[PDB]
Design a protein around this ligand. Structure first.
Ligand SMILES: O=P(O)(O)O[C@H]1[C@H](OP(=O)(O)O)[C@H](OP(=O)(O)O)[C@H](OP(=O)(O)O)[C@@H](OP(=O)(O)O)[C@H]1OP(=O)(O)O
Ligand SMILES: O=P(O)(O)O[C@H]1[C@H](OP(=O)(O)O)[C@H](OP(=O)(O)O)[C@H](OP(=O)(O)O)[C@@H](OP(=O)(O)O)[C@H]1OP(=O)(O)O
Ligand SMILES: [Zn+2]
Ligand SMILES: [Zn+2]
Ligand SMILES: [Zn+2]
Ligand SMILES: [Zn+2]
Lengths: 384, 355
RNA sequence: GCUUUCGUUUUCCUAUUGAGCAUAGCCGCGGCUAUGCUCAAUAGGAAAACGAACAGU
């Protein structure tokens, strides 16, 4: 099953970039999101991302003209958001049966179908909490019929909240670092910190894959499976994405309001590993692709968060673009009240998601993990 | 021009540190031909917490670079005014003012400011997106111009628990109310700046709004209301031609450094977290409000002014009706333009009697 | 001891400008056109070795 998913992703990517320059043959982390219409359906790759770089501290934009992280699975979810936006433009009364959404209780917001299953394929494991192991301890693949998760908590430093920092390799925890995120502080030379990968999947599961922007229109979309081409671990990943939150009993889950409930998807490894993995050859290119694009494999610069080339125009997976798509959806959905408001105010306007996020940070702090280190408030709130 | 200012400031810093990062400095120029000499110098990017507050004003609060440099310059001005006498008025930079009651600085002498980076607050609100003489600010979003308060454990600010105002705001307060401090308006006319040199960041519209031109956004109705001899100063804004192109994202030193012309080689170190001298003995800071009050009392005793020897620090500060009116009008004008409310500390901190 | 940014050395290619040597051609002893090699300056792309960025697994 996982072998089919990996072959699907690799085939789509290779058939897309067959006629491009050879300079794309270097080391790259390839991450895709594949949809399955039903159990018997073969499945089609619905979102493709590459790139392993983040903007520099000076490169940050007060008008949202950068992609803060160009990472493989992060770009994969940005393309997934673009796919969801495109589908919501496609979604209507006539194509409801073919579409991938069905209205929830009251019809205010939609949810994915139960047959339609989402599977996040990644070449390697997500950075941060999901990478607490060693290469020589990479466990093999077994076929378990049960859906029961077995997370591991052997050390108190496992499960904390971590951040990836510019110029700084690895993932650094969210300690009680009293440096409040401030814009001009960063400009004068304070490091920029970004929420890590697995720490940004805990949210996708406790809160939603759609982010806080998209929860105004659809119910939280949950991963149905995570397939890893490399660095797969059962307990570590299962803790990192779904059950680090509920280590201390159901008191965390029961407090969380519907529909923002925890969810333990199925995890898996590709049937046959890929032999080639060299430490070097890492390139600044980032390939972004959505299913609605066609044959355009957009190329970006991760050191600067913009399109590769001397022109270096605006990309399409950036906060400005995603907010333009937000405005397009609002115009399509007649969301006039939210159509004339700002960015951070729009993120906070999701009362349910905001309260769920606050409960998330409160519980993460109570279990001795950490708060939710964020960007400066004037960077997460801008106008166009 | 501005490259000369930067080189002079940096060589003076090196000269002070030969016997032994952000920087602000104030230099004096007797004339165009003269090279110029430093009078104030400071560093630092820290502010005290909410637990080290002093009811008697024994601890310095705002430990940033520009503010401590201004302080130090105030101490130099106290020493320079004390050195005045009728025998050596010609060689001194002071001359009697109108009415003969108060001194003033000479017309040829000018004061310039160099800041190694854009000041915090409204001075670094721009992303990557000396021929002139007119000031042209930029007003793009309502966020620009809002008063900001320093945060604890950080270089940045937050828009408007102990709270201190941002560096750019304070350098607006100087330009409006002069550099002469609070207790020296009895005997001294206000002293202003002439130029500003931002050696590592620069915007021809952002700094002029940060320091000078934001009190002129809604017209010239703020200068006329202010009473003479208090006027808004517009220093000439410049950037060093060749700058350090490389940005350090690592940790920095929190200790502030200060020096003034009258000190000589007595470089002083402070810790911004607490507000005391760097040392296990927990020494009293020589630039604290206590020392300023003591020097003011010494100046009144020397000048045979027994009138102000009875009053306390707060009473002496409010005794000058013109200056307090100028302050109150400045704060009201900042409030009126929708830039926020100047967070004034309670009067109990500065209302103490020496024992 | 594995896990983004700075640089140093070497190699290769493309583009622009200038000089030296040799060959073929033409015009009124002189001058001009084309080709091969060497050097000097700048821009872009690729690879190898080494060094530092801070900080947590
Ligand atoms: O870019 P992403 O990795 O997809 O996540 C970004 C952003 O993180 P970045 O630092 O990378 O920009 C925010 O994460 P933090 O600021 O907390 O670190 C978060 O928004 P919040 O700050 O409100 O949590 C999230 O938003 P969402 O919840 O919708 O997924 C989303 O923001 P964008 O939609 O602007 O990309
Ligand atoms: O010593 P500084 O850092 O340069 O600032 C202090 C103080 O500011 P902070 O308490 O924030 O550090 C006062 O500002 P407020 O807090 O009261 O708003 C104000 O003196 P006032 O109490 O009279 O306002 C000011 O300037 P000034 O020279 O006019 O006094 C000066 O006070 P000191 O000169 O006593 O240090
Ligand atoms: Zn990552
Ligand atoms: Zn689980
Ligand atoms: Zn500052
Ligand atoms: Zn001005």
């Amino acid at each position: 099953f996982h072998d089919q998913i990996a072959m699907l992703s690799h085939r789509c990517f290779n058939t897309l970039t067959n006629s491009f320059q050879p300079s794309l043959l270097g080391r790259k982390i390839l991450a895709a999101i594949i949809m399955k219409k039903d159990s018997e359906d073969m499945g089609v790759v619905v979102s493709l991302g590459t790139g392993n770089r983040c903007v520099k501290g000076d490169s940050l934009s007060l008008k949202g003209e950068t992609v803060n992280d160009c990472h493989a699975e992060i770009i994969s979810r940005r393309g997934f958001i673009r796919f969801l936006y495109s589908e919501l433009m496609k979604y209507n009364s006539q194509t409801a049966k073919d579409s991938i959404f069905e209205p929830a209780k009251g019809g205010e917001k939609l949810q994915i179908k139960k047959t339609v299953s989402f599977h996040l394929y990644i070449s390697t494991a997500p950075c941060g909490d999901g990478a607490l192991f060693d290469k020589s301890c990479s466990d093999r693949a077994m076929e378990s019929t049960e859906s029961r998760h077995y997370p591991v908590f052997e050390n108190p430093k496992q499960g904390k909240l971590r951040t990836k920092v510019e110029n700084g390799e690895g993932t650094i925890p969210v300690e009680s670092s009293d440096i409040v995120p401030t814009w001009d502080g960063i400009r004068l030379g304070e490091r920029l910190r970004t929420m890590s990968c697995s720490d940004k999947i805990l949210r996708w599961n406790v809160l939603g894959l759609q982010g806080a922007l998209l929860t105004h229109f659809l119910q939280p979309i949950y991963l149905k499976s995570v397939t890893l081409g490399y660095l797969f671990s059962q307990g570590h990943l299962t803790r990192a994405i779904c059950c680090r939150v509920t280590r201390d009993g159901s008191a965390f889950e029961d407090g969380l309001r519907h529909p923002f409930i925890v969810n333990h998807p199925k995890v898996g490894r590709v049937s046959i590993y890929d032999s080639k993995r060299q430490s070097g050859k890492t390139k600044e290119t980032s390939v972004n692709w959505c299913l609605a694009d066609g044959y355009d494999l957009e190329i970006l610069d991760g050191t600067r968060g913009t399109v590769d080339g001397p022109r270096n125009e605006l990309s399409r997976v950036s906060k400005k673009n995603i907010f333009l798509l937000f405005k397009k959806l609002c115009s399509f959905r007649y969301r006039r009240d939210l159509l004339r408001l700002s960015y951070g105010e729009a993120k906070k306007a999701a009362r349910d998601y905001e309260t769920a996020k606050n409960y998330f940070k409160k519980g993460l702090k109570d279990m001795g993990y950490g708060n939710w280190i964020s960007k400066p408030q004037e960077e997460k709130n801008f106008y166009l």
